[PDB]
Homo-oligomer: A and B are copies of this chain.
């Protein structure tokens, strides 16, 4: 079943998640800002809609191409984080899509009381915006999983990252392992409106 990815430009979690789908020969639709990145992704077989996730027109088109049975995966970041996500969720519903995995971060939502002051100073506003995105998703018609990774690191997947629920967490996780967890959640029979923290215990930056 097709995947529609937002935030898969660049080299982060989205990029790695898209590469897993491609290696699988899975139908993939993505929205990408840069025209040149678009064609290079298109040559790998991605159906690339060029534009911005705040563009309701571009978003609707991508949703239409993916189809009502598609899974949306969002790893978006940046200026217009809440609005971009509201657009995606709203257009998803209109297109008959009913499943979405949203990747935010530790500190969002009910994990906010455990966010450190140092982390809040650096990422506070981004986290609050992503929290609005979680909210809009949780009150939407979509089935969902929300994944809140801790500090993102590069490197090879370790397979040691753990999904944790309903409890304070702090730590790090490799981007490659967040992609693996997205893949696992996506392939399960249902998302079941779940919220998870995601860290590899005791993993640390060098």
Expressed in whole angstroms, the Cα–Cα distance for A132 and B112 within the complex equals 15
A162 at the A/B interface (Cβ < 8 Å)?
no
Residues of B near A135 (CB, < 8 A) are 109, 128, 131-132, 135
A 130-146 to B, binary, CB cutoff 8 A, 1 in contact else 0:
01100110110000000
Looking at the complex, which one of B128, B136, B138, B139 makes contact with A139 (CB distance below 8 Å)? B128
A80-132 residues with Cβ-Cβ distance < 8 A to B are 109, 112, 127-128, 131-132
Expressed in whole angstroms, the Cα–Cα distance for A28 and B158 within the complex equals 59
A142 to chain B, nearest CB (A): 13
Expressed in whole angstroms, the Cα–Cα distance for A132 and B131 within the complex equals 9
A106 to chain B, nearest CB (A): 14
Looking at the complex, which one of B112, B127, B136 makes contact with A138 (CB distance below 8 Å)? B112
List 5 other contacts, CB 8 Å, given A132-B132, A135-B135: A112-B139, A127-B139, A128-B139, A131-B135, A131-B139
Closest 5 CB pairs of A and B: A128-B139, A135-B135, A112-B139, A132-B132, A131-B135
